[PDB]
Amino acid sequence: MIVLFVDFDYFYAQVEEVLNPSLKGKPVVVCVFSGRFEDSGAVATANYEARKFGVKAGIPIVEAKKILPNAVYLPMRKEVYQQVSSRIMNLLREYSEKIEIASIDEAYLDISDKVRDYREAYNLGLEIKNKILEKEKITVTVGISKNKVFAKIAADMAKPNGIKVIDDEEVKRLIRELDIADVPGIGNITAEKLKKLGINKLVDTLSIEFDKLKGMIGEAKAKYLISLARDEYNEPIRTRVRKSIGRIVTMKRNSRNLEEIKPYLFRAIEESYYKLDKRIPKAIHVVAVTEDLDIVSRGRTFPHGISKETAYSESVKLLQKILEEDERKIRRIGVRFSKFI
DNA sequence: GGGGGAAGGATTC
DNA sequence: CATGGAATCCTTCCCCC
């Protein structure tokens, strides 16, 4: 069982440099401007030139400018990044039939066939990196190991523009030395929760009573970490199918007014429907981000597909139910369509 | 005593 | 001051063998 994981370096920013090579070498910051005021919004991502000064994904654009006022600030162009990503995902398909497109810039390849050991694997990794750089001029990081989790962890250790193999002898020691927070799927909340239980390394999950563990992080997460520490994790690489499509936008001012929110809601619906492109949803959810950043949603499942007209009608009703409950002002609003026919 | 949906929410990348 | 898209996994009904 040999897994090769490919992760594109500072993707959005790298794409912008590809589209304008003169940016190469300068700090580049891809932003999502919300139009609330001059420079309101957040950083989608940034290149390493900017990253070394503390400018990274998630920080307010405003804070990024205080740190690097002379960096290059570019608005996010999602559409473009997706097409570039697709072309790269297609190249990857030429190296294995078993492929899992995990996100817009990640992919796992099951190369248990194409190769018979970590040597051929490491070389197949360079063949792949070299090929992507050559055809799309995009540097990526490769991680190779016994499974998806460790192949991804391996990539995390080598980025940017790297390649690393985590062999069967190195996995065993990581299960003992690796900070459990660096484990994929363990975010700040799960991490700052395993500590209260006394779990700082994967190995620690083996000396605690399952039932206690389950009650703290849930059954799935439980069995997940246990199977990894017990070196038994082995999820198959499989192509995921889009199960939902949607869009959430930011309003200029926080509001509780229906007619003030509608415009944003309808715009989210129009964009979502465009993206559906022939797919017909039976379920619709209206999502609202309140002023204190809490996420509230209301949805309905119909016994048939939802026409754009029905979506408009149903969304307002759902938006009203949200306002009837939480009396908090709404900051962001949008919709999500799922349960395709 | 449990299957199978459906909802509202939680957490991650 | 802090955007945005989508998957998985909870917890709680709910209807009803």
Ligand SMILES: Nc1ncnc2c1ncn2[C@H]1C[C@H](O)[C@@H](COP(=O)(O)OP(=O)(O)OP(=O)(O)O)O1
């Ligand atoms: N907080 C975010 N907001 C909006 N878009 C994001 C955010 N984080 C990541 N993305 C999008 C754009 C990133 O270029 C893309 C890939 O992220 P990754 O997590 O792949 O970061 P990079 O941006 O790839 O950094 P790196 O080289 O460390 O992997 O996903």
Ligand SMILES: [Ca+2]
């Ligand atoms: Ca990634």
Ligand SMILES: [Ca+2]
């Ligand atoms: Ca990446």
Ligand SMILES: [Ca+2]
């Ligand atoms: Ca983490």
